Design a protein around this ligand. Structure first.
Ligand SMILES: CCCCCCCCCCCCCCCCC[C@@H](O)O[C@H](CO[C@H](O)CCCCCCCCCCCCCCC)COP(=O)(O)OCC[N+](C)(C)C
Ligand SMILES: CCCCCCCC/C=C\CCCCCCCC(=O)OC[C@H](COP(=O)(O)OCCN)OC(=O)CCCCCCC/C=C\CCCCCCCC
Ligand SMILES: CCCCCCCC/C=C\CCCCCCCC(=O)OC[C@H](COP(=O)(O)OCCN)OC(=O)CCCCCCC/C=C\CCCCCCCC
Ligand SMILES: CCCCCCCC/C=C\CCCCCCCC(=O)OC[C@H](COP(=O)(O)OCCN)OC(=O)CCCCCCC/C=C\CCCCCCCC
Ligand SMILES: CCCCCCCC/C=C\CCCCCCCC(=O)O[C@H](COC(=O)CCCCCCC/C=C/CCCCCCCC)COP(=O)(O)OCCN
Lengths: 114, 303, 129, 70, 98, 105, 83, 347, 99, 71
């Protein structure tokens, strides 16, 4: 009874965010602070449409915004961020609590730069 | 390299329980103004080896009328459970990380009575059957209060994860938060393994013996992790391992001390002890430890 | 795909049930029921029910079958119907079980009353006279 | 004297030392020089799966930094 | 309805048939009843977990508790019968007849 | 027979546990929440006979979600035809289904 | 009053375990309704976010709903920090 | 046992029945059945002796098997539809399993074998409770799901119960087994109208409960459990025998007694549904129940059996305890036929 | 997988070592030459079973402390423990814990 | 971001399954490519066997039991 419609494989092509979980956890707070508007647009559309096929453009937008965020991080605060996510990757639970020092370094670096 | 990890867990436990028998005769001997074995080996160090060799070479006295099936199954189950109890424990990292590790240990301890039941039933003797029934009743009676005390203590941990016990005791031991529960837990672990003052009862005998001493050391490790938490540094777990092993050794020496210090109870006396002194206090302290985190707004995080 | 591990466990479960359903030598029937209970616990654990499987393995095996053996001693296709998403940062089974104290007040009341009545009934029956 | 009990206690201590140290060393060896990642609650399991799919060598512990974002 | 549910239902049917046979040994009757409740526990748990119905995670616990209480009651009755006759044989319960 | 004490007193003794779509803890949804919600809204206030005769579409969809008999039948037919073709030798799986693909986050 | 005091003094002798058990149980029953931190525990349980906070569709009639997390609108957790 | 414990157990039995009657969740109905079973055993075993223990273990086995079957039916219903509410059963197999479990609980044929022996083993008070109160919960559950029952199976077991009760009551000299077979026949009458009208089922249940209460209270008053022991009742208390004879005539369905009401209304309702053969067979079979009621009346009141010398002492003493509502139950089981149209109250 | 392998290794090692223990001294040649049914133990076992059931009821407590309905869960847990204590007290006062 | 990636991955797997299904079932007489088993047109979350049905056994076993067996 009916045909299930699916978007073509071309519609699902987008420049992926190729960073691991530790980098994402290290940058998560500033990522949520900066990239809030596209993320909230996407999630509102997601709980309103109740259909993944209706929310592809917002997903591409949030990918683009995350890419811009990480490009700014690479441009300005590369090495403090590298040390911070090195911490976060070492721990088995990926706990924020263990090297608050590197977190402070990254925070002051981003506060001074951006 | 998982098999290597499993073997490096199993073999040292057997060596430890093999040398635990030598340490028990030495500590007791010195508490009795004498020495332990100090002839076989430089300081009795070969005594454990000699005993093992003699036992494995002595004739086994099969009853010639008993059921061979349960007779051979009972030591297998006993030793298998004794070795399995070791896997969940975090020293600092567990071989197998379980969400409900404490519950798993409770279940294994619950199974541990089937070896007693089957050995008593297959012995083909009424008196041995009476002794086995008596031991089984004592064991289940005390595992009741073990479970209640364990859940009361874990109410301050937030889950059944054993690794979380290290985080809970990062600044202070659990002994200071609840010492009466620790006292009753220690006495219940005495009663579980049939150790004095609760010891009311060649190959297979050796197997059964190994299982009992492995259970003793495992109880000591679980108690040390539960109530005397060591500080763990993620970049140097050797410190945590050393502290944990030292505390376990101290607690085992404490059992040997207690064996050397006291007479033994009667059966009705230990049943009355449990059912009329430990259970009411355990229930009252369980109510208290349910109410305390809510009263003090100190509920642990994990859910 | 491990040749339908769930299927193998189910067949072992059924074989154990046929084993103790023949009712030979009630101690051996109890052993067969112990094996069947262990296999069922394995089925539940492999399905994803860690706490409920552990409840089986602890309560059922270590209390009820132990009491059964004590009393006897006194005398003479898969992987397809599964889900797609995740659960969050908790296990839904634990949340549903813990909801017994916030949602199941009526259930707790009736179960506690039944347990107390069972204690009283056992006492009255075993008085004898 | 009482210190003649010490050799046996030391043997016991080394035997009990072996398991924990061995487990920690194997965990560091098989997890790329870091602690073994723990996965309860099914979300950090998804994190591990995404890490494995992102690494390109089918290993989660191979961490992809900001150098891989181009 | 896949094959695992069919296997568990077959186990329940086998346990019920074994209960209804009565070769002897009322203890075996209690064992068959407990096998039936174990099968019920397993199959209900599978149904509840498969459909993600969160609130029925209670029900297997309640079933287990009630069935174990019934098991204790049956064990007490069996003990009383054995103390009356010296054995738990089924054929000794022939005093009352249709 | 049935004495509706709960509806008389508004007690809600056991109604919270009757259906999948009724206030699960932490807002965890059932696997077939939408289908059962649609079926319940279809049949409300109509009566059992009329609900059975007229809301059959919603109940059929709900049962299909619950047991997935049709979906498993279709998948089994597809896999059987694929097996027949690969045994005969006119079809070859793509690298996507042979494990040679490029995974995505 | 004298009978109750005599009963308590006689129970504290030859039955200290039961007296301690009843005292601890009664205190555990009574104290939670009198402590002021139980509301703090409830509030802490309220503030633990297990789910994603789904945004609301803005229609210009929600001055109390913040447009950004940094906005002053919305619940605060400074009380939890001060604890 | 202690009177406090007995009162608590009776209240627990009644509360389990009420929990079955008032709940809308299948698990709660199962819990109510379990609670009732748990609290029922000591009541049956109140007077400790081997016969009571044997009756109690038979009853426990039967009820535990029935409860397991009921739980299995609930689980299958949940499997084929994610529903816990007691409504349409939603599955043919689940319905069959549930019907057999409820028949086993009620004692309908072919699951009738336990009722006579359990009744014979227990005392008269436990028999009264078992034959009156222990029918409310299963019948209420059957009424709630009456639209799901397959009429063929229900009617088959109903007719079987009527035939079995009629035939098995003919062979009995013990009064308790006679009452058990009468209960089986009345259950068969009650369940033959569930597919068509539940109000008739409830009316029959009320009438039978009143009649059974009257009969058991009369039997307790004149402490006889055998036909010959009851044959001595005329020499001390002839009024009790006359009332018992009137009650027995009522229980046989003879108009214008109260017992004619349920059979009359059930026949009329079944005829409204174009069913003719089954009511005729049912009345023909109830003739057997009437026959053994008449035999009991002949042995009890219509003739005078020989007595013994030691009755002269019994002539000098009066009953210390008088049972309240015995007079009301006799009148209600004898003279309520003119009030028949009151059944519209959905009793 | 890992737990299955660990249990298999434990069982295999135990079986191998027990069998070698039972067969090593079997190669050399040598000579090769009731009723009581105490009721109290059964009551102990039944009491253990009932208390174990009530403990099983008490087991989900660590997760029940995060419900936002703290008063209701506290009341229900205290109710369960109070009935557990009541069962113990009833069996105490009815001479059910004597020898 | 995880939600967006999950949606894209699921849609891609469904599209690949549809393509291989269209290729495979070309000669079946009464078959229809991409036909739903539901009367409603609402989007339905696919099962585990719908996405990995035509894939190899190792990743089927992974996606099914990896979290359960990970210790
Ligand atoms: C009205 C007639 C009263 C007299 C007749 C009583 C009949 C027998 C007694 C049993 C009935 C007791 C009524 C309890 C019904 C349970 C529901 C009610 O209590 O509300 C609950 C509130 O719980 C109450 O605190 C329960 C207190 C009562 C239990 C304590 C004593 C129970 C004793 C009753 C008899 C048991 C044996 C006898 C013991 C002496 C619900 O809490 P709430 O949070 O809003 O909603 C939960 C849903 N959420 C999660 C979505 C929010
Ligand atoms: C014997 C021990 C049986 C059960 C031991 C394992 C219990 C356990 O919890 O391990 C399950 C483990 C991890 O679960 P979690 O702790 O919740 O966290 C992992 C995901 N984050 O994963 C598994 O389920 C793997 C093992 C499941 C399949 C096998 C289950 C056991 C089957 C044993 C059958 C043999 C029984 C024979 C009779 C026994 C009589 C004593
Ligand atoms: C299908 C079922 C059809 C039901 C038919 C019911 C018929 C109604 C009467 C049934 C009585 C059967 C029992 C019976 O009579 O047993 C033989 C009995 C044995 O005596 P007891 O009192 O039991 O023992 C004395 C020694 N201690 O012998 C007798 O006394 C017979 C005397 C009574 C005869 C009654 C005549 C009844 C027949 C009249 C014709 C119509 C009968 C009813 C059906 C007719 C067919 C439509
Ligand atoms: C902590 C470390 C502990 C390790 C665990 C224990 C390791 C076990 C090591 C086993 C050592 C070898 C023991 C061999 C001696 C067996 C006992 C013995 O002396 O038997 C002598 C016996 C006497 O028989 P008869 O003279 O013919 O008749 C007398 C009756 N009228 O002679 C024999 O049977 C000889 C048997 C051949 C043994 C030769 C092989 C040695 C065994 C190697 C171990 C194999 C398993 C590893
Ligand atoms: C209101 C709180 C309720 C919840 C708290 C309770 C939790 C757990 C405690 C209950 C466990 C079960 C109690 C069982 C009671 C048994 C009573 C009994 O029979 O004991 C008497 C003996 O003890 C008694 O006399 C009965 C009880 C005596 C009174 C106990 C204390 C009463 C209240 C004291 C505390 C009051 C409040 C504390 C305030 C302190 C200030 C901070 C018989 O003992 P035998 O074994 O026969 O040995 C005698 C032979 N030598």
């Amino acid at each position: 009874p009916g045909i299930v419609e699916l978007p073509t494989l071309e519609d699902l092509k987008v420049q992926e965010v190729k960073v691991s979980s530790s980098v994402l956890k290290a940058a998560a707070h500033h990522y949520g602070a900066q990239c809030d508007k596209p993320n909230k647009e996407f999630m509102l559309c997601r709980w309103e449409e109740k259909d993944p096929r209706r929310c592809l453009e917002e997903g591409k937008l949030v990918n683009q915004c995350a890419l811009d965020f990480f490009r700014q991080i690479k441009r300005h605060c590369a090495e403090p961020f590298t040390e911070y996510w090195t911490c976060i990757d070492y721990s088995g639970l990926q706990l924020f609590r263990h090297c608050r020092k590197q977190q402070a370094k990254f925070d002051e670096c981003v506060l001074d730069k951006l | 390299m998982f098999m290597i990890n499993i073997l490096s867990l199993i073999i040292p436990i057997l060596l430890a329980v093999a040398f635990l028998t030598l340490v028990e005769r030495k500590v007791l001997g010195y508490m009795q103004l004498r020495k332990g074995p100090n002839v076989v080996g430089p300081y009795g160090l070969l005594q454990p080896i000699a005993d093992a060799l003699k036992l494995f070479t002595k004739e086994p006295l099969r009853p010639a009328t008993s059921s061979i099936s349960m007779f051979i199954i009972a030591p297998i189950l006993a030793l298998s459970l004794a070795l399995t109890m070791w896997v969940p424990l975090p020293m600092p990292y567990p071989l197998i990380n379980m969400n409900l590790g404490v519950l798993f240990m409770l279940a294994m301890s619950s199974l541990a009575v089937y070896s007693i039941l089957w050995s008593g039933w297959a012995s083909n003797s009424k008196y041995a059957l009476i002794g086995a029934l008596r031991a089984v009743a004592q064991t289940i009676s005390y595992e009741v209060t073990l479970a209640i005390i364990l859940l009361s203590v874990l109410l301050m941990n937030g889950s059944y994860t054993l690794s979380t016990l290290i985080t809970t005791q990062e600044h202070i031991w659990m002994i200071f938060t609840s010492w009466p529960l620790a006292m009753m837990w220690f006495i219940s672990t005495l009663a579980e393994t049939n150790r004095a003052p609760f010891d009311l009862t060649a190959g297979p005998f050796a197997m059964f013996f190994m299982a009992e001493y492995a259970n003793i050391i495992m109880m000591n490790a679980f108690t040390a992790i539960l109530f005397l938490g060591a500080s763990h540094d993620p970049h140097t777990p050797e410190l945590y391992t050393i502290n944990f092993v030292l505390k376990t050794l101290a607690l085992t020496i404490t059992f040997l001390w207690i064996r050397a210090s006291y007479p033994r109870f009667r059966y009705d006396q230990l049943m009355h002890l449990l059912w009329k002194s430990f259970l009411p206090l355990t229930l009252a302290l369980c109510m208290w430890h349910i109410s305390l985190p809510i009263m003090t707004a100190s509920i642990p995080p994990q859910s | 795909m491990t040749m339908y591990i769930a299927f193998i466990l189910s067949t072992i479960f059924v074989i154990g049930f046929v084993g103790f359903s023949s009712k030979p030598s009630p101690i051996y029937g109890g052993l067969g029921l112990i094996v069947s209970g262990g296999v069922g616990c394995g089925i539940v654990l492999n399905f994803g029910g860690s706490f409920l499987g552990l409840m089986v393995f602890l309560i059922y095996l270590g209390g009820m079958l132990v009491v059964f053996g004590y009393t006897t001693a006194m005398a003479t296709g898969d992987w397809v119907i599964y889900d797609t998403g995740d659960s969050g940062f908790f296990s839904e089974e634990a949340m549903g079980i813990a909801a017994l104290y916030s949602y199941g007040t009526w259930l707790v009341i009736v179960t506690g009353w039944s347990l107390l009545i069972g204690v009283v009934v056992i006492m009255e029956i075993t008085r004898g006279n | 004297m009482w210190f003649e009990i010490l050799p046996g206690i030391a043997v016991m201590a080394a035997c009990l030392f072996i398991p924990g140290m061995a487990t920690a060393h194997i965990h560091k060896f098989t997890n790329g020089g870091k602690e073994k990642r723990v996965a309860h609650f099914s979300y950090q399991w998804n994190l591990m799966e995404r890490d494995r799919r992102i690494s390109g060598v089918n290993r989660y512990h191979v961490t992809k930094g900001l150098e891989n974002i181009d | 309805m896949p094959l695992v549910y069919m296997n568990i239902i077959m186990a329940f049917a086998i346990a019920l048939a074994g209960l209804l046979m009565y070769r002897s040994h009322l203890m075996s009757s209690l064992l068959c009843l407990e096998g039936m409740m174990l099968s019920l526990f397993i199959m209900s748990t599978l149904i509840i977990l498969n459909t993600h119905f969160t609130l029925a995670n209670m029900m297997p616990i309640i079933l287990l508790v009630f069935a174990a209480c019934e098991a204790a009651l049956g064990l007490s009755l069996l003990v009383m019968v054995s103390n009356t006759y010296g054995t738990d044989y089924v054929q000794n319960l022939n005093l009352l007849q249709c | 027979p049935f004495f509706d004490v709960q509806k008389r007193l508004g007690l809600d003794l056991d109604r919270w546990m009757t259906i999948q779509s009724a206030e699960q803890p932490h807002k965890i949804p059932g696997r077939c929440h939408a289908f059962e919600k649609e079926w319940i809204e279809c049949a409300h206030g109509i009566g059992g006979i009329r609900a059975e005769k007229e809301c059959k579409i919603e109940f059929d969809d709900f049962v299909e979600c619950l047991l997935r008999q049709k979906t498993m039948k279709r998948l089994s037919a597809i896999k059987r035809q694929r097996d027949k073709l690969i045994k005969e030798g006119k079809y070859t799986p793509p690298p996507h289904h042979l494990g040679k693909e490029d995974p995505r986050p | 009053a004298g009978r109750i005091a005599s009963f308590l003094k006689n129970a504290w002798a030859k039955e200290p375990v039961l007296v301690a058990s009843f005292a601890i149980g009664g205190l555990a029953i009574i104290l939670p309704s009198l402590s002021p931190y139980t509301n703090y525990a409830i509030r802490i349980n309220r503030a633990t976010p297990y789910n994603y906070p789904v945004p609301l569709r803005d229609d210009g009639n929600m001055p109390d709903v913040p447009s950004h997390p940094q906005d002053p609108q919305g619940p605060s957790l400074e009380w939890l920090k001060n604890l | 046992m202690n009177p406090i414990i007995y009162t608590t157990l009776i209240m627990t039995v009644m509360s389990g029945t009420m929990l079955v009657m008032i709940s809308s969740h299948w698990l709660l109905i199962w819990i109510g059945f379990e609670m009732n079973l748990l609290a029922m055993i000591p009541v049956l075993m109140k007077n400790f002796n081997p016969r009571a223990t044997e009756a109690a273990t038979k009853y426990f086995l039967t009820q535990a098997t029935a409860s397991m079957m009921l739980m299995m039916a609930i689980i299958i219903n949940l499997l084929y539809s994610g529903q816990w509410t007691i409504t349409k059963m939603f599955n043919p197999v689940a319905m069959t399993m549930m019907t057999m479990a409820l028949a086993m609980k009620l004692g309908l044929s072919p699951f009738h074998f336990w009722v006579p022996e359990v009744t014979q083993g227990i005392s008269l008070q436990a028999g009264l409770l078992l034959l009156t109160w222990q029918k409310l919960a299963p019948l209420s559950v059957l009424c709630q799901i009456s639209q799901s029952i397959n009429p063929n199976l229900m009617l088959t077991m109903a007719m079987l119960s009527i035939l079995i009760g009629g035939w098995g009551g003919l062979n009995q000299t013990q009064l308790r087994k006679i009452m058990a077979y009468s209960s089986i026949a009345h259950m068969g009458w009650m369940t033959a109208v569930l597919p068509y009208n539940t109000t008739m089922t409830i009316l029959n249940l009320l009438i039978y409960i009143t009649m059974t209460l009257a009969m058991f209270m009369l039997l307790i008053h004149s402490s006889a459990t055998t036909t010959l022991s009851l044959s001595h009742t005329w020499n001390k208390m002839p009024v009790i025998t006359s009332l018992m004879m009137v009650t027995l005539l009522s229980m046989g369905g003879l108009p214008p007694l109260s017992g004619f009401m349920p059979k009359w209304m059930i026949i009329q309702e079944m005829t409204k549904n174009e069913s003719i053969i089954m009511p005729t067979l049912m009345a023909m079979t109830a003739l057997l129940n009437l026959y053994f009621y008449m035999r009991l009346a002949y042995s009890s009141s219509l003739t005078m059996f020989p007595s013994t010398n030691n009755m002269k002492m019994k002539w000098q003493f009066e009953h210390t305890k008088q049972m309240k509502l015995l007079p009301t139950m006799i009148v209600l089981s004898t003279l309520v036929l003119p009030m028949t149209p009151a059944l519209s109250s959905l009793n | 997988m890992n737990i299955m392998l660990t249990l298999l290794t434990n069982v295999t090692l135990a079986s191998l070592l027990v069998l070698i223990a039972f067969w090593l001294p079997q190669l050399n040649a040598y000579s090769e030459k009731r009723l009581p049914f105490s009721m109290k133990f059964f009551l102990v076992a039944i009491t253990f079973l009932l208390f174990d059931l009530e403990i099983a009821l008490l087991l989900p407590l660590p997760w029940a402390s995060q419900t936002n309905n703290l008063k209701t869960m506290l009341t229900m847990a205290l109710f369960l423990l109070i009935l557990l204590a009541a069962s113990l007290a009833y069996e105490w006062t009815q001479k059910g814990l004597e020898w | 971001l995880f939600q967006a990636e999950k949606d894209r991955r699921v849609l891609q797997m469904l599209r690949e399954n549809l393509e291989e299904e269209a290729i495979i079932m070309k000669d079946v007489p009464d078959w229809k490519v991409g036909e739903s088993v539901f009367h409603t047109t609402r989007w339905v979350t696919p099962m585990m066997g719908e996405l990995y049905g035509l894939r190899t056994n190792e990743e089927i076993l992974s996606a099914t039991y990896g979290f359960i067996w990970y210790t």
